[PDB]
Amino acid sequence: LDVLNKKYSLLDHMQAMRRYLLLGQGDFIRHLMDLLKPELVRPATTLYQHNLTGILETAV
Amino acid sequence: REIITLQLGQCGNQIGFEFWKQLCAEHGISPEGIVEEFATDRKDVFFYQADDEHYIPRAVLLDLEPRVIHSILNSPYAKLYNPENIYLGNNWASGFSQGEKIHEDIFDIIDREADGSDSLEGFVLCHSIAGGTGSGLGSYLLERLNDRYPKKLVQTYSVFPNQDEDVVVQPYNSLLTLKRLTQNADCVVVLDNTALNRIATDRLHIQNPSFSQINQLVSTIMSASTTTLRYPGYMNNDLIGLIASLIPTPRLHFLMTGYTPLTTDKTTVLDVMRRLLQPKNVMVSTNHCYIAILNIIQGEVDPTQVHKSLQRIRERKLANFIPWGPASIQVALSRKSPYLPSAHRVSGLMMANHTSISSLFERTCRQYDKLRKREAFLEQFRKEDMFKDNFDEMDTSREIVQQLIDEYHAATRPDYISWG
Amino acid sequence: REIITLQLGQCGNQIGFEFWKQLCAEHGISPEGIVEEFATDRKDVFFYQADDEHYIPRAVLLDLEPRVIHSILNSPYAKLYNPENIYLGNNWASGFSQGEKIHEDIFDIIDREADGSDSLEGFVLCHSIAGGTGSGLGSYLLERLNDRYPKKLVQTYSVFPNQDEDVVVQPYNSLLTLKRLTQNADCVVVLDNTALNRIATDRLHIQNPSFSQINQLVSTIMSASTTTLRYPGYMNNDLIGLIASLIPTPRLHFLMTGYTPLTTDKTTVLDVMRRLLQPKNVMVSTNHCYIAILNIIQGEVDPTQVHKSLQRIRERKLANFIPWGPASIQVALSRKSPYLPSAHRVSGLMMANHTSISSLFERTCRQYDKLRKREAFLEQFRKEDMFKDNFDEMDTSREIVQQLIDEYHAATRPDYISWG
Numbered sequence: 001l002d003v004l005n006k007k008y009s010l011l012d013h014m015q016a017m018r019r020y021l022l023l024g025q026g027d028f029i030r031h032l033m034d035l036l037k038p039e040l041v042r043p044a045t046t047l048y049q050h051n052l053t054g055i056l057e058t059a060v
Numbered sequence: 061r062e063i064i065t066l067q068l069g070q071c072g073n074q075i076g077f078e079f080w081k082q083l084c085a086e087h088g089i090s091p092e093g094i095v096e097e098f099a100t101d102r103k104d105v106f107f108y109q110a111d112d113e114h115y116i117p118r119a120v121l122l123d124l125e126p127r128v129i130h131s132i133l134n135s136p137y138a139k140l141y142n143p144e145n146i147y148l149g150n151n152w153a154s155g156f157s158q159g160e161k162i163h164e165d166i167f168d169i170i171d172r173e174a175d176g177s178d179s180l181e182g183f184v185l186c187h188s189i190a191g192g193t194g195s196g197l198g199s200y201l202l203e204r205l206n207d208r209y210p211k212k213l214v215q216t217y218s219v220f221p222n223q224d225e226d227v228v229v230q231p232y233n234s235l236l237t238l239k240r241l242t243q244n245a246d247c248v249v250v251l252d253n254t255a256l257n258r259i260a261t262d263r264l265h266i267q268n269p270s271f272s273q274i275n276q277l278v279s280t281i282m283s284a285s286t287t288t289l290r291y292p293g294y295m296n297n298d299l300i301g302l303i304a305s306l307i308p309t310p311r312l313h314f315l316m317t318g319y320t321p322l323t324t325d326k327t328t329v330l331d332v333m334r335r336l337l338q339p340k341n342v343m344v345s346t347n348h349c350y351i352a353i354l355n356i357i358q359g360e361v362d363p364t365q366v367h368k369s370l371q372r373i374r375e376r377k378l379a380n381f382i383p384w385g386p387a388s389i390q391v392a393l394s395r396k397s398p399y400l401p402s403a404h405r406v407s408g409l410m411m412a413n414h415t416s417i418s419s420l421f422e423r424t425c426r427q428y429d430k431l432r433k434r435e436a437f438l439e440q441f442r443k444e445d446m447f448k449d450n451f452d453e454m455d456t457s458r459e460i461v462q463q464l465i466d467e468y469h470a471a472t473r474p475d476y477i478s479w480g
Numbered sequence: 481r482e483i484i485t486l487q488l489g490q491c492g493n494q495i496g497f498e499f500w501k502q503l504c505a506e507h508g509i510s511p512e513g514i515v516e517e518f519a520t521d522r523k524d525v526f527f528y529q530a531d532d533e534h535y536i537p538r539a540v541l542l543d544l545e546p547r548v549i550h551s552i553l554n555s556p557y558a559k560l561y562n563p564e565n566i567y568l569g570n571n572w573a574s575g576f577s578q579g580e581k582i583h584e585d586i587f588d589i590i591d592r593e594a595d596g597s598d599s600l601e602g603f604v605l606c607h608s609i610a611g612g613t614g615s616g617l618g619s620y621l622l623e624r625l626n627d628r629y630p631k632k633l634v635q636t637y638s639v640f641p642n643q644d645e646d647v648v649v650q651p652y653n654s655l656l657t658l659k660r661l662t663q664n665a666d667c668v669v670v671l672d673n674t675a676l677n678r679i680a681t682d683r684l685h686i687q688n689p690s691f692s693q694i695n696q697l698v699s700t701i702m703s704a705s706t707t708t709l710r711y712p713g714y715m716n717n718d719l720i721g722l723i724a725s726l727i728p729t730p731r732l733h734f735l736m737t738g739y740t741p742l743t744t745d746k747t748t749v750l751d752v753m754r755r756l757l758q759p760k761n762v763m764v765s766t767n768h769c770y771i772a773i774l775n776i777i778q779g780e781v782d783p784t785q786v787h788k789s790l791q792r793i794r795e796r797k798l799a800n801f802i803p804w805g806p807a808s809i810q811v812a813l814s815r816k817s818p819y820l821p822s823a824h825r826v827s828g829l830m831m832a833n834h835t836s837i838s839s840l841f842e843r844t845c846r847q848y849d850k851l852r853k854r855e856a857f858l859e860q861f862r863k864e865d866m867f868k869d870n871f872d873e874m875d876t877s878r879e880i881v882q883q884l885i886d887e888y889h890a891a892t893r894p895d896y897i898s899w900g
C-alpha cells in the first residue's frame with residue numbers, strides 16, 4: 001500500500017476519477033459543454049475524433 | 061463567463077469598495093493585488109488575471125460630483141483595482157441628465173473590459189435606490205445595458221433605503237428607479253437600511269454610526285451570495301444556473317436575505333436551517349407566502365446528513381410557500397475558505413422570493429401618493445421641469461409599480477395560473 | 481542563392497545603411513568588414529566573401545541630388561560596404577526622367593555584381609513610395625530589372641508613407657509607383673510611417689524625432705524577415721521557397737508585418753503566438769479576412785509543445801480568415817544569434833497576406849481622386865507636362881490600382897475561384 005500510494009498514487013487517481021469522469025469537477029464540465037455545443041448539435045455519423053481530442057484540451 | 065460589476069454613486073461605490081476588499085482577504089490577494097505567499101478557488105469569474113499574478117477585479121467605478129471616490133483613491137488597495145477606468149445633484153432627474161452627456165465614454169469603459177475578458181455573462185450593479193446621483197444615473201445605465209447586450213443579464217444589489225423616512229424627494233426618486241428596475245433588470249437582491257440598523261441595534265450597541273458598521277453587514281451578505289460561484293462544485297456552478305430557481309416569473313424578481321450567524325464573531329445543519337427561517341435572522345423590515353426558497357451553507361457541515369435534515373423541516377410544517385403549482389426548499393453546500401479564521405465554521409445565508417417585500421414597495425408608493433397630492437416637493441427645479449414638463453413618467457412609474465404591487469398579491473392567490 | 485539589395489533614395493538609403501549595420505553586429509563582422517576574435521551561419525547569401533575575410537555586403541547604393549549619401553560616407557562602416565559602386569527633384573516624373581539618362585552606368589553596376597555572384601536569386605529594393613527622388617527613379621529601375629532578368633524575382637521593402645497626410649503631390653507620386661509595383665514586382669512587404677509612429681508613441685515617449693527612432697523599428701522587422709535564410713538548418717533555406725506561401729495570387733503580393741515583443745528590450749510558444757495575432761503587435765494602420773498567415777520564432781523554444789501550441793491558437797481563433805485559398809497559419813522556428821543580447825529569450829515576427837491593406841491603398845487613391853478633380857497640384861512643371869502632356873499614366877495607374885482594390889475585396893468573397 002505505501003508504494004502503491006507514492007509510486008503510482010493509487011489514491012490521487014480515485015479523487016480525480018470522480019472529480020472529472022463523474023462530473024464532480026463541476027466547472028470543467030460546464031465550459032466543455034459550452035464549447036462542445038456547435039460540434040455536437042450536428043449529426044455525428046459525420047463527426048471526426050481529431051476535433052474532439054482538440055477541444056477537450058482547450059477545456060482543461 | 062467573467063462578471064463585470066458596475067459600482068456607481070457614492071453609496072454604491074462604498075459597498076463595492078468593501079466587497080472587493082472582502083474578497084481580497086478571503087481570496088489569496090494582498091492590497092497590491094499580488095498573489096499572497098501564504099496561499100483551490102475559481103478566481104477566473106471575479107478576478108482578471110494579469111501576467112505577473114496581479115488579479116485585478118473587473119470593477120467599473122463611476123464617480124459623479126466625486127468626494128468619496130477621492131478617499132477610495134487614497135487607500136492601500138488603490139493598486140489592487142487598476143483597470144484605470146474612473147470617469148468624472150440629489151435629484152433623480154439631475155442624475156439621469158448628467159449620465160446622458162457622458163454616456164459614450166462610460167460605455168466605452170464597459171466595452172474595453174468586455175473585449176478584454178474571454179467572455180462576459182452578467183453586469184452586477186452596486187446600485188443605490190433614491191441615491192441622489194446614484195439613482196437616475198443608475199436607471200439610465202440600466203436601460204442602455206439591456207439594449208446593447210440583449211442576450212446578457214443584469215443583477216442589482218439594490219440597497220433599498222428605509223431610514224424611518226434627509227431627502228424630501230426620496231419617494232419620487234425611488235418611484236422612478238423601480239419602474240426602470242421592474243422591466244429593465246433580469247434580477248434584483250433587496251436590502252433595507254432600517255432592517256440592518258435594527259440588526260445593528262440587536263447584535264451591537266452601534267446606533268449613531270449606522271452607515272459605517274452596516275457596510276460590513278451588506279458585505280457579508282454580498283460575498284456570501286456569490287461563494288457557490290467563487291468556489292467550485294457539482295451543482296449551481298454558474299450565475300444564471302442559480303438565478304433561475306430564485307426568480308420564477310420575470311415580473312416577480314426581488315430577493316430577500318438572511319444570515320443564521322447575524323452575530324457572526326459545533327452547530328448541526330438541522331440547527332442552522334431552523335435558525336434562518338426565524339425572523340430575527342431576516343434582514344428585510346390577507347395571507348402572505350414565499351414563492352420559492354433556497355439556502356447555501358459554508359462550514360464543517362457533515363454533508364451526508366443534509367437530507368435527513370430536510371425531511372425533518374418538511375414535517376414540522378415550518379414553511380407555507382405557494383398554492384399555484386409546485387415549489388420546494390432547496391439545500392446547497394459550499395467550502396468556507398481557508399486562511400481567514402473559520403471560527404463559527406458553519407455559517408448559512410438564504411436568498412428567497414417573498415411577497416412581504418411588496419409591502420416595502422407600497423410604503424414608498426404611499427409616501428409618494430401622499431406627496432404627489434400635496435405637490436410639496438415637485439422640485440420645479442428647471443432641470444426637473446425642463447427634463448420632465450409633463451411629469452407623466454412618475455405616473456407611468458406609478459401604474460407599473462402598482463401592476464407589480466398587484467402582481468405580488470395575485471401570486472398569493474390560488475390562480476396565478478390565470479393572468480397576473 | 482546570393483541576393484543583391486538595390487537601396488535607393490535618401491529614405492531608402494537610410495534603412496539599407498541601418499539594415500547592413502544591424503547584420504554587421506548580429507553576424508561576425510566589425511565596422512571594417514573584418515571578422516572579429518569573438519566571432520555556424522550561411523553568411524554567403526547576404527555577404528560577398530572576399531579573400532582576407534572582408535565580408536562586404538552586395539549593396540547597390542544609388543544617390544540622386546545627394547545629401548544623406550555624403551553622411552553615409554563619413555561613417556566607421558564606410559570600409560564595410562566597399563563594392564565602390566555609388567553614382568551621382570521631389571516629383572515622381574522628376575525622379576523617373578533623371579534615372580533614364582544614367583540608366584546604363586547604374587545598370588552596369590548591377591551587371592558587375594551579377595558577374596561576381598555564382599547564381600543571382602533576387603533584387604531586394606529598400607524602396608521609398610512617394611519618396612521624391614526615391615519614387616519615380618525606383619519605378620523606372622523596377623521596370624528595367626524584370627525585362628533584363630525575366631527568370632529572376634524582385635521584392636520591395638516598401639515603406640508606404642502615412643504621416644496623417646510635406647508633399648502636396650504625395651498621392652500622385654504614390655499612385656504612379658503602385659501601378660509599376662503591381663505589374664512589375666513579384667513580392668512587396670508593406671510598412672507604414674503612422675503605424676510605426678503609433679507604436680513609437682505606445683512603447684516610448686518619442687514623438688518629434690519619429691524618423692530616427694522608427695528606423696530601428698523598420699530594421700528589426702527587416703533583419704528578422706530574412707533570419708530563416710541567413711542561418712543554417714532545413715528551415716525555408718532559400719528566399720523563393722518562403723515567398724510562395726505568403727503570396728497566393730499573382731496580383732495580391734503585399735505583406736503585413738508584426739513583432740510579438742515590440743518591447744523586446746521565460747515565454748512559451750503558446751504565448752508568443754497569441755500575442756502576435758492581437759492588433760497592438762501589428763505595425764500596419766463588409767467582412768475582411770487574411771488570405772494565408774506565416775510566423776517565425778527565434779529563441780529558447782521547446783519543440784514538443786509546438787503541436788499542442790498549433791492546436792491551442794486554432795481553438796482560440798484569435799485570427800479570423802475565410803479566403804478563397806485553403807491556406808493555414810504555418811509554424812516556423814530559427815536560432816537567435818550569440819554575442820548580441822538574448823533579452824526576450826523567445827521573440828517572434830509574422831508576415832501575412834491581409835485584405836485590410838487594401839484600405840491603405842484606397843486612402844491614397846481617395847486623396848488622389850479628390851486632388852485629381854481639383855487639379856490643385858498638377859505641377860504643370862515643364863518636366864511634369866513635357867514628360868506627361870496627356871497625364872493619362874495617372875488614369876492608367878488609377879484603373880490598375882482600382883482593379884487591385886477590386887481584386888482584394890473579390891478575395892473576401894466566396895468566388896475568387898472566378899475572375900477577381
Ligand SMILES: Nc1nc2c(ncn2[C@@H]2O[C@H](COP(=O)(O)OP(=O)(O)O)[C@@H](O)[C@H]2O)c(=O)[nH]1
Pocket residue numbers: 069070071074149150188189190191192193194219221222223253271272274275278
Ligand atoms: N447601506 C449604506 N447606505 C448608504 C451609506 N451611505 C449612504 N447610503 C445611502 O445612500 C442614499 C443616498 O445616497 P447619497 O449618499 O445621497 O449619494 P450622493 O448623492 O452621491 O451623496 C441614502 O438612501 C442612504 O441610505 C452606507 O454607508 N451604507
Ligand SMILES: Nc1nc2c(ncn2[C@@H]2O[C@H](COP(=O)(O)OP(=O)(O)O)[C@@H](O)[C@H]2O)c(=O)[nH]1
Pocket residue numbers: 489490491494569570608609610611612613614639641642643673691692694695698
Ligand atoms: N521610415 C522612414 N521614412 C522616412 C525617413 N526619412 C524620410 N522618410 C520618408 O521618405 C519620404 C520622402 O522622401 P524624401 O526624404 O523627401 O526623399 P528626398 O527627395 O531624397 O529628400 C516620406 O514619405 C517619408 O515618410 C526615415 O528616417 N524613416
